Structure 1
Amino acid sequence: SKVSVAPLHLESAKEPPLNTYKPKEPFTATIVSVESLVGPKAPGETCHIVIDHGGNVPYWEGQSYGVIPPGENPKKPGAPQNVRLYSIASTRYGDNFDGRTGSLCVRRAVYYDPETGKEDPSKNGVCSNFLCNSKPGDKIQLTGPSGKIMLLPEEDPNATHIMIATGTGVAPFRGYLRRMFMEDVPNYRFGGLAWLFLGVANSDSLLYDEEFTSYLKQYPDNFRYDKALSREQKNRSGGKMYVQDKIEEYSDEIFKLLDGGAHIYFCGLKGMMPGIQDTLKKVAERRGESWDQKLAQLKKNKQWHVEVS
């Protein structure tokens, strides 16, 4: 039932591609499609952008593309805009299974006057709105790919991977999970446990929910899926249900998975990390263990993968 992908030679590279294109001479790619991923009650629009790179900017799952929006640097006249990085939300074969496209998961950065609620498009985010405003056939200046922290360790195809995302931080995990469960990749037959924790504002802010729910039904012994809907659910203390609260629910089980060698990944808002770290520390110290030492050991054993901003 897995999807045929091509071309298999994307499996042959021994090292991840890195900085194939640089800001000084970006690759001119072409938009294939842009679609909203969210419902009307979502607090902002998050869009899914499919980009045709023609096979010229291949990548591994977990990497990022840079995008240079058009225009001049506002704080450097005569100069191009700075690169904005976006975690790639597709597998190396991309959403058309042909190794020609990659996808981004982009939240429109929109400014509202805090008192009047008044929108002001002059203060909106340049690149995020450029991308979600794009249309088929538009050109995109691409750099990269970049990133090694979030590469998926594939040495053990029965490994455990605990994936913790807030909002568009889900992007790399869509790529991981498609590779683990959707695509017919003969050199990676995942037989382990993948456990996605996703925190979003409300049910309408869910990103790729139908896809992840399909893995639940198709691979119930290998995929688990927990959601923290911050504006629809309350945690034990009556505060907003964030991912660190959902982790807390399973904290015993997670710590045991981590002691057995599981990988844990964090992507999204940097603000979630103190709360997550506080949750795991409580479990360690419950057990009589120094969290500082355990975290240092997790990093030395390459189990601890953080890319937040």
Structure 2
Amino acid sequence: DVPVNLYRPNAPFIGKVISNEPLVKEGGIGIVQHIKFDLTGGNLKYIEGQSIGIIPPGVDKNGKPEKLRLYSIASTRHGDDVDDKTISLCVRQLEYKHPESGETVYGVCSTYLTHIEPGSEVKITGPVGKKMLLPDDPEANVIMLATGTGIAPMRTYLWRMFKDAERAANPEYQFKGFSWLVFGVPTTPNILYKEELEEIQQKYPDNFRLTYAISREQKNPQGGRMYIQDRVAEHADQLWQLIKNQKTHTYICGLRGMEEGIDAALSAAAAKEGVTWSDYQKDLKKAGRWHVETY
């Protein structure tokens, strides 16, 4: 029932860019763009929590054709316009240091995508992934630990839950559980979808809690810069008591390196009640209630 690999890299869907909008505001670090693709002409269908491949043009340094790169789908199954005609991505331009031969190195597929113009055609494959699916249970609790572009699966959950046009389009999914997003970025202009995240929390103050960890603007109790792991440490007992509910799911998305600090905090929380988190977490993983996708 879950759509997967409707398109494969030997014969990918040639979609077309509708829009390419900036998500990082003035005064922020880096470039993250919201890119929306036209899916008409084909049959790419997808749900929340899945990814797609994009194959960038050109060859590598060895002269071989470039391979696909996976990106978390940033839209619900219906697309941003709730017309079931498009798909959106949340793409950050990878750029890095001198000791990788040169000076600043720019990632192939990410630079391509963040600079791509409306009207351009793109090789799209997928969808893929069953690790990050949203439960159909409206009474489910959904904890969302995200940094940077790991917001993208979170945005698909939240939009389906809380957007007026989504509610009207999903008679069966009228969310009434609780959801809690801890979102980690370096500055306030780097809060992707800040306006819409905060508006969702205004409409649904009892069903959505939004928590930020902004490193360049906030210190943890030890005097260091604030990260997502610090906010989880700070709310560890609440987060543990939510996790004990049979209906509670937890999603972790973003660049790799966050999972350790999150675990040590929940380890100290669980231990208070004579539970070793790492084994309890094994059972949550088998139960399909502990979702992680870092990269």
TM-score range relative to shorter protein? over 0.9
Indicate conservation of the 8 Å contact 1:67/1:140, yes or no: yes
Question: Quick one: distance in 1 between partners of 2:197 and 2:103?
Answer: 34
Question: Quick one: distance in 2 between partners of 1:129 and 1:253?
Answer: 40
Q: 2:46 aligns with which of 29, 54, 59?
A: 59
Indicate conservation of the 8 Å contact 1:17/1:145, yes or no: yes
- List gaps (5 residues or longer) in structure 1: 1-14
Aligned position for 1:47: 33
Does residue 206 in structure 1 map to residue 187 in structure 2?
no
Question: Quick one: distance in 1 between partners of 2:273 and 2:206?
Answer: 28
Does residue 157 in structure 1 map to residue 143 in structure 2?
no
How far the C-alpha of 1:292 sits from its partner, in A, is 2.5
Question: Quick one: distance in 2 between partners of 1:43 and 1:278?
Answer: 29
Task: Give me the TM-score of the superposition, normalised by structure 1.
Answer: 0.90
How far the C-alpha of 1:283 sits from its partner, in A, is 0.9
Question: Quick one: distance in 2 between partners of 1:210 and 1:37?
Answer: 11
Question: Quick one: distance in 1 between partners of 2:131 and 2:177?
Answer: 21
Cα deviation digits, residues 259-296 of structure 1 (max 9, x gap): 11210100002100011111111111122212232112
Q: 1:230 to 1:250 in 2, by over 3 A?
A: same
Does residue 292 in structure 1 map to residue 272 in structure 2?
no
Task: Give me the TM-score of the superposition, normalised by structure 2.
Answer: 0.94
Q: 2:149 aligns with which of 150, 153, 168?
A: 168
**SS in structure 2 opposite 1:62?**
coil
Aligned position for 1:270: 256
Cα deviation digits, residues 287-309 of structure 1 (max 9, x gap): 22122321122223221000111
How far the C-alpha of 1:145 sits from its partner, in A, is 0.6
Indicate conservation of the 8 Å contact 1:110/1:119, yes or no: no
Question: Quick one: distance in 1 between partners of 2:278 and 2:83?
Answer: 44
1:128-167 paired onto structure 2 within 5 Å? 128-154=110-136, 156-167=137-148
Aligned position for 2:217: 232
Over the matched positions of the two proteins, sequence identity in percent amounts to: 48
Q: 1:41 to 1:103 in 2, by over 3 A?
A: same
1:1-309 paired onto structure 2 within 5 Å? 15-54=1-40, 56-75=43-62, 77=63, 79-113=64-98, 120=104, 123-154=105-136, 156-182=137-163, 183=166, 184=168, 185-261=170-246, 262-309=248-295
**SS in structure 2 opposite 1:80?**
coil
**SS in structure 1 opposite 2:158?**
helix
**SS in structure 2 opposite 1:198?**
strand
Amino acid of the structure 1 residue aligned with 2:150: G
- List gaps (5 residues or longer) in structure 2: none
Indicate conservation of the 8 Å contact 1:266/1:307, yes or no: yes
Cα deviation digits, residues 114-134 of structure 1 (max 9, x gap): 7xxx954xx310100100111
**SS in structure 1 opposite 2:95?**
coil
RMSD (Å), alpha carbons: 1.5
